């Protein structure tokens, strides 16, 4: 089943840098569900707010590794959600 993380936990870990327009003390109210897809190497990440799904993104491990090799440290995984590439790779793969 999905693995779930709050934005607060990801922020503590360094995976998450910030969420635009959301006060930091409200990060507990955002959760990210990480789901393996049928294609091994593609991950389905869902962004929830107060349990409501707001956005969904598919991430390809080869693309993330390419970013890493090219020195891209951070990325907007969702329109308002900034994440660290290296730590995201580890989160998806640990």
Curated annotation (Swiss-Prot):
Tissue distribution: Isoform 2 expression is enhanced in testis.
Superkingdom classification of source: Eukaryota
Function summary: Binds to activated CDC42 and RAC1 but does not seem to stimulate their GTPase activity. Associates with calmodulin.
Protein name: Ras GTPase-activating-like protein IQGAP2
Residues of the full protein shown: 1477 to 1570 of 1575
